[PDB]
Design a protein around this ligand. Structure first.
Ligand code: APZ
Ligand code: APZ
Ligand code: ZN
Ligand code: ZN
Lengths: 372, 372
């Protein structure tokens, strides 16, 4: 296969369905990427992740650079070899989780200095260091290092962050290109910023296209603005990005958010919702989510979802999973996560098929009627 | 298959190898039974438990009678259906864990009254109630309700406990026999008591054989007496039990304890050591156990054990599992437990084959030389 090749097979409105071909595999779009936090997709062996339908997973860079170390993972053979996932891996830049999880962060034009929320150590994450870490991890899809703008953001602050992000995108591009092995085997995605402001989003899209990337992510969303606002921004933001390249909406994963985002031109998604199960007990169904811990499920012999074809819904009842979760058992987390990620992959499949068959709009309508 | 049929295929000294045929399946002996605590073998799907080589698992009654309830499990279709394990299940009586884990236990000739260490509720576990609960769970091998004697024990206290246990064994037998469905589909094992005293052990064995059971467990051991003492007691205790019925050593599982116990006539074992992994990081190897959390394993690419054929040792390195455990990841627990239970099943296989081939004594010798 080629280093990178995105081809759109079908369209309906702003929605697209196709494939991204990479050396390690084919990614069917619209795609949902399960999240591997500390070199692991929570409570699932990689074979189980693949069994659910996933073509690619997202690897958190922040956690990896701290815990085992990027250099260590490289010495061990890379992330794929390390965790046992031989298919594509998109890695974030680590900056977003640095601002959210690290201590005493100091920002500058060079990058971000911070203290680990673990051992209290120090790091200087810059566009160059971020690209290098993703290379050491052996990432297939590398994210440019940017600065996510907090919500709400004033026009001047959103402008300053976006402009810095564009300068960092140029540095990320150059860093990526100077490393021959990485430039020839991996892909680089740029990230659009600009908060909820159209003119800033336009300036960002233009700067990104001018630099040129293999894919374009819509950043700065799913940070507290709400669905109506998120959709409004995507309405004018997605059309600004190059049409022939993948559109990635970072950190967006509620089933309805995904459907609405695909209707607006998004090709890629990632979220912790599926994997962050095992505790609160939320299980997705076509009739909306349910909390398995609720007493009404104690003697419910039916599967998590009546039509889901995952191994969990074939073998275990709501009553059993209810028991496991309330007992704090590891298997409860394993079962809930497998079903949840399976449900998401089934949702992406239904989206891909409906687009290919010119009935996506009808699918979105029917999906919402039932889900809500 | 029959309700119960134990046949010895080969012998070497006191050691025996054979099979126990039951309606739900065949159990190869000597056998190791993984422990399912709250209707689950810690961090493993039942198919994974079977994949390791297990023919039967042990189900804790104490936890089940409290958490989901025996009556509830019966309404849901039984434990097998509930947890997804369709093979034999040996259930303990619940008494041992009542004394170890419950609050304000009050003992009497009728049974034991206690408070749940969960909701602070109350129960009156008696021989009759214990047998009934195991029936409601749909147990294949039912353990008679007894009174484990604390170590150390004075002759008079050991005598009083053993005598009460024998009276309770008679009540367990009668209770089992009066329930037609249970008497026709399940088996009943009696438990020998008597602490470290030979005369008491002899009195216990005689009372048990007089009542008549499908199997005989050696109780009152692995309670703080040490290996030398345990072996000394087994030396004279096992020969007292009927030779043509299985000999079950309860709560014994260290690899060397198992080998020594088989040399003394034991056919069945169970222990939490394999399943209780995922935290401290102990992994069994043919070169003795290792603690994967140790820094020396951070960059060790070799599998947990060089010859173990489990899926974990085929796919992941010590370095990866080291990382997972230290990161507190669920997958670390899943991987460690699968390997550990797989290692135990491989040990039982080596024991079964060496006995069948008349070279068990040599195997025990070679096993210890390397393990220690
Ligand atoms: N919701 C998210 C999630 C992740 C990211 C990111 O990694 N970079 N930049 C972003 O804007 C962003 C937004
Ligand atoms: N080590 C163990 C473990 C369990 C038991 C038991 O369940 N009954 N009786 C016993 O003596 C006993 C000893
Ligand atoms: Zn399912
Ligand atoms: Zn192994």
């Amino acid at each position: 296969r080629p280093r990178f090749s995105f081809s759109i097979a079908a369209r309906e409105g702003k929605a697209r369905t196709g494939t991204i071909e990479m050396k390690r595999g084919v990614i069917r779009t619209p795609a949902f990427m399960p999240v591997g936090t500390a070199a692991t997709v929570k409570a699932l062996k990689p074979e189980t992740v693949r069994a659910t339908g996933a073509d690619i997973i997202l690897g958190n860079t922040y956690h990896l650079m701290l815990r085992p170390g990027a250099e260590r993972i490289a010495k061990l053979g890379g992330l794929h070899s390390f965790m046992g996932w031989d298919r594509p891996i998109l890695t974030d830049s680590g900056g977003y989780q640095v601002m959210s999880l690290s201590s005493l962060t100091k920002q500058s034009e060079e990058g971000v200095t911070f203290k680990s929320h673990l051992d209290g150590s120090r790091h200087m994450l810059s566009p160059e260091r971020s690209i290098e870490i993703q290379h050491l991890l052996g990432s297939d899809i590398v994210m440019a290092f940017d600065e996510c703008t907090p919500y709400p953001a004033t026009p001047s602050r959103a402008a300053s962050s976006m402009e810095r992000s564009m300068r960092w995108a140029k540095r990320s591009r150059d860093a990526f290109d100077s490393r021959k092995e990485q430039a020839e085997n991996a892909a680089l995605f740029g990230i659009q910023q600009g908060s909820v402001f159209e003119n800033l989003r336009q300036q960002s899209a233009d700067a990104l296209a001018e630099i040129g990337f293999d894919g374009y992510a819509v950043g700065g969303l799913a940070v507290g603005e709400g669905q109506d606002e998120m959709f409004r921004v995507l309405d004018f933001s997605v059309p600004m990005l190059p049409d022939d390249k993948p559109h990635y909406l970072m950190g967006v994963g509620k089933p309805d958010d995904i459907v609405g985002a695909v209707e607006r031109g998004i090709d890629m998604f990632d979220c912790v919702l599926p994997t962050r199960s095992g505790r609160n007990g939320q299980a997705f169904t076509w009739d909306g989510p349910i909390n398995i811990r609720n007493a009404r499920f104690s003697e419910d012999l039916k599967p998590l979802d009546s039509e889901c074809h995952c191994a969990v819904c074939q073998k275990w009842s709501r009553a059993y999973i209810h028991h496991l979760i309330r007992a704090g058992e590891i298997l409860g987390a394993m079962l809930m996560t497998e079903h949840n990620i399976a449900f998401y992959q089934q949702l992406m499949q239904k989206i891909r098929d409906s687009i290919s068959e010119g009935r996506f709009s009808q699918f979105a309508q029917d999906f919402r009627a039932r889900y809500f």
